[PDB]
Amino acid sequence: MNNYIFVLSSLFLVGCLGLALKPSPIYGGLGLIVSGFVGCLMVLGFGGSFLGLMVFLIYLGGMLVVFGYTTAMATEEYPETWGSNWLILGFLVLGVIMEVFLICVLNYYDEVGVINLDGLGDWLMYEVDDVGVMLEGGIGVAAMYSCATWMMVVAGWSLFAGIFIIIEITR
């Protein structure tokens, strides 16, 4: 329980590690739908249920296109991804041993407090709201329409122009 988010966090670092080794874009895309899901857990492990689901709505319909084009532009006769060579599988297993190494190194140097495996799980929320109402996220994201209505025009204009910026690149 106390070791909840350190697990969700290290399974994210790994979901972004194999993502960095650059297998075929499918098993990288799979490597991001996972880490995007895992991102919905820790964002939600610290409160707001909205923001986590968003990543887990964008980068589903995001990676649904990444499945489409890779079948048309980015794909070999043989994908040759993870269980296909030993150059990736070494630096996929020695990245994880480097992880268990490194985090276990600097709990010995428990002076900067970058990780405190003994003082773990006890510092995650920091005095939230206990008696309270109308506090969740989505009240903040809805400031696009009150008191932060410039985040709104500036991002809407990007999508108004993306629709024109994109076709002149195809044409």
Partner 1 sequence: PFLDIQKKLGISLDRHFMFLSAEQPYKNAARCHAFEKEWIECAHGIGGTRAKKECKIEFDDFEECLLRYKTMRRMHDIKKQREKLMKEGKYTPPPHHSGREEPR
Partner 2 sequence: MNPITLAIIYFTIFLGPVITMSSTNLMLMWVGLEFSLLAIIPMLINKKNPRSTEAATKYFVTQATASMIILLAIVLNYKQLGTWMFQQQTNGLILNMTLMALSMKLGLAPFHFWLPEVTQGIPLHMGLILLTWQKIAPLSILIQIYPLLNSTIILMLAITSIFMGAWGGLNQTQMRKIMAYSSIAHMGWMLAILPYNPSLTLLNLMIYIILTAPMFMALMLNNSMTINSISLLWNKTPAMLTMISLMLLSLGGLPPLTGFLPKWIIITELMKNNCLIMATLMAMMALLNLFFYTRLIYSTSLTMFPTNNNSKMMTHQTKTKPNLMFSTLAIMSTMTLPLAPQLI
Partner 3 sequence: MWFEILPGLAIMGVCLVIPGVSTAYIHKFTNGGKEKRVARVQYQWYLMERDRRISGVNRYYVSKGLE
Ligand X SMILES: CCCCCCCCCCCCCCCCCC(=O)OC[C@H](COP(=O)(O)OCCN)OC(=O)CCCCCCCCCCCCCCCCC
Shortest gap between Cβ of 125 and partner 1 (angstroms)?
A: 10
- Among 161, 156, 159, 135, residue whose Cα is nearest residue 144: 156
Shortest gap between Cβ of 102 and ligand X (angstroms)?
A: 8
Residue 82: contacted member of ligand PC1, partner 1, ligand X, none (CB under 5 to 8 Å, by partner type): ligand PC1
What is the DSSP secondary-structure string of 42-94?
HHHHTS-HHHHHHHHHHHHHTHHHHHHHHTTTS--SS---STT-SHHHHHHHH
Footprint of ligand PC1 on 94-123 (CB under 6 A): 96
User: For the CA atoms of 86, 89, 90, 91, what is the dihedral angle to 10 degrees?
Assistant: 130
Asked if 69 touches partner 2 (CB under 8 A), the answer is no
Angle of the 49-61 helix axis to the 25-45 helix axis, nearest 10: 170
Q: Looking at residue 131, what DSSP letter applies?
A: S
**Binder of partner 1 out of 126, 130, 167, 168 (CB under 8 A):** 126
Shortest gap between Cβ of 2 and ligand X (angstroms)?
A: 16
**Binder of partner 3 out of 1, 73, 112, 128 (CB under 8 A):** 128
Binding span for partner 2 by CB under 8 A among 13-21, 34-42, 51-59, 150-158: 150-158
Angstrom distance (rounded) from CA 160 to CA 150: 15
Compare residues 122 and 168 and give the one whose CB is closer to partner 1: 122
- Where along the sequence are the contacts to ligand PC1 (CB under 6 A)? 14, 34, 81-83, 92, 96
